[PDB]
Design an enzyme around this catalytic site. Structure first.
Site, mmCIF file in Angstrom:
data_model
loop_
_atom_site.group_PDB
_atom_site.id
_atom_site.type_symbol
_atom_site.label_atom_id
_atom_site.label_comp_id
_atom_site.label_asym_id
_atom_site.label_seq_id
_atom_site.Cartn_x
_atom_site.Cartn_y
_atom_site.Cartn_z
ATOM 1 N N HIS A 294 0.809 -1.216 0.000
ATOM 2 C CA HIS A 294 0.000 0.000 0.000
ATOM 3 C C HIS A 294 0.855 1.285 0.000
ATOM 4 O O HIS A 294 2.080 1.247 0.198
ATOM 5 C CB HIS A 294 -0.906 -0.011 1.231
ATOM 6 N N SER B 183 1.713 3.945 -5.240
ATOM 7 C CA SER B 183 2.258 5.200 -4.731
ATOM 8 C C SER B 183 3.562 4.994 -3.951
ATOM 9 O O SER B 183 4.537 4.495 -4.491
ATOM 10 C CB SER B 183 1.197 5.889 -3.876
HETATM 11 C C1 MYR Z 1 -12.254 -2.321 4.738
HETATM 12 C C2 MYR Z 1 -12.549 -0.869 5.040
HETATM 13 C C3 MYR Z 1 -11.313 -0.019 4.787
HETATM 14 C C4 MYR Z 1 -11.685 1.295 4.108
HETATM 15 C C5 MYR Z 1 -10.540 1.781 3.226
HETATM 16 C C6 MYR Z 1 -10.694 3.248 2.846
HETATM 17 C C7 MYR Z 1 -9.736 3.623 1.717
HETATM 18 C C8 MYR Z 1 -8.594 4.513 2.200
HETATM 19 C C9 MYR Z 1 -8.280 5.600 1.176
HETATM 20 C C10 MYR Z 1 -6.781 5.819 1.021
HETATM 21 C C11 MYR Z 1 -6.357 5.479 -0.399
HETATM 22 C C12 MYR Z 1 -4.839 5.447 -0.552
HETATM 23 C C13 MYR Z 1 -4.227 6.839 -0.398
HETATM 24 C C14 MYR Z 1 -2.790 6.832 -0.885
HETATM 25 O O1 MYR Z 1 -2.321 5.777 -1.372
HETATM 26 O O2 MYR Z 1 -2.140 7.902 -0.853
#
Ligand code: MYR
Ligand code: BOG
Length: 310
Positions: A69, A137
């Protein structure tokens, strides 16, 4: 008075349940659903004495896909993307140290170089010697360094809107940074919706109570996240000199309307890679694997089929 105290007990009881217990169980229920649908379950392993939380699914007899991630995110970013993959692959998604449910030592380094070594140590810790890497990212920045540093281990590399190059067009994030604004660090509860707007073109539906808790969690993490972000700036490692060292087939996949890291990044990386593939998804933002998961997974499966089939 006994009644005033009794009423005081119930008032705190209801408040504690409403403010603390109900949101937590809500998140646990949604995780249970989304992980269960993807065939993923949670484990942890100590790596250099750090607890690293991770999800795992699929058969260990199948090739391993390790998913990494990005900044401020966690392993649950990958659930819907992983769902069609666990039938044919051994899928692993970790929380990087500093994030999610993994250890967050206050005095550690969180630069992508140090993180790439932790990920390699993590793969050894769960007994994986050869694997496909995918990173989004900040996680893509890390995955690329792993692939450049340990070519014997990496069967393929997927860079999904990765950090690590300086493209011709300045992204809205980098514009924001010049004025001291960073949408990726959520200081106030209202800035969480702002973060979602920043990384999604079409945001997936999110129940209001779940959204508020996610926003609360993001605020609580913001001070530490800001410190890590400063390390990513001060201890930045350019990928341009490293990409030519990569031996693995490398997928470059972007959302065309990524406001965080610009799609023109692909033009920097393509000439520098021995074996590049390219996918640009239309009307999509910074996190294609979350915004349009099955579509992104299908492009990735197609890429993997090519890597395997010839
Ligand atoms: C299983 C429930 C979890 C909910 C996840 C919400 C998503 C989070 C949004 C962040 C996306 C990545 C941001 C990044 O990579 O900079
Ligand atoms: C906006 C950032 C990504 C949001 C991820 C949504 C996770 C929870 O999403 C919810 O889960 C339910 C059951 O799983 C679905 O049926 C609902 O439609 C959905 O709102």
């Amino acid at each position: 008075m006994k009644r005033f105290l009794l009423g005081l007990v119930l008032l705190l009881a209801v408040a504690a349940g409403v403010l603390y217990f109900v949101p937590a169980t809500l998140l646990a229920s949604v995780r249970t659903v989304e992980r269960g649908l993807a065939g993923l379950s949670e484990h942890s392993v100590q790596v250099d004495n750090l607890e690293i939380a991770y999800l795992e699914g699929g058969s260990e007899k199948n090739p391993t896909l390790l998913l990494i991630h990005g900044f401020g995110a966690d392993k649950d970013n990958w659930l819907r993307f992983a769902r069609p993959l666990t039938e044919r692959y051994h899928v692993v998604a970790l929380d990087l140290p500093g994030f999610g449910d993994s250890s967050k030592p206050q005095q550690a380094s969180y630069d992508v170089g140090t993180q790439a070594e932790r990920v390699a140590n993590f793969a050894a810790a769960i007994g994986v010697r050869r694997l496909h890497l995918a990173g989004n990212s900040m996680g893509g920045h890390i995955a690329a360094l792993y692939a450049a540093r340990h070519p014997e281990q990496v069967l393929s590399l997927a860079l999904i809107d990765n950090a690590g190059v300086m493209p011709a067009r300045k992204s809205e994030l980098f514009e924001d940074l010049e004025r001291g604004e960073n949408p990726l660090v959520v200081r106030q509860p209202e800035d969480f919706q702002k973060l979602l707007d920043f990384v999604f073109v079409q945001q997936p539906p999110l129940p209001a109570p779940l959204k508020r808790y996610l926003g609360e969690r993001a605020v609580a993490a913001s001070a530490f996240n800001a410190q890590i972000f400063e390390q990513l700036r001060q201890r930045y490692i350019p990928l341009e000199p490293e990409l030519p060292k990569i031996e693995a087939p490398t997928l470059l996949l972007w959302g065309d309307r990524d406001r965080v890291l610009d799609v023109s990044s692909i033009e920097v990386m393509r000439p520098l890679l021995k074996r590049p593939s390219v996918v640009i998804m239309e009307n999509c933002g910074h996190v294609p694997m979350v915004e349009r998961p099955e579509e992104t997974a299908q492009h990735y499966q197609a890429f993997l089929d090519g890597v395997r089939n010839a």
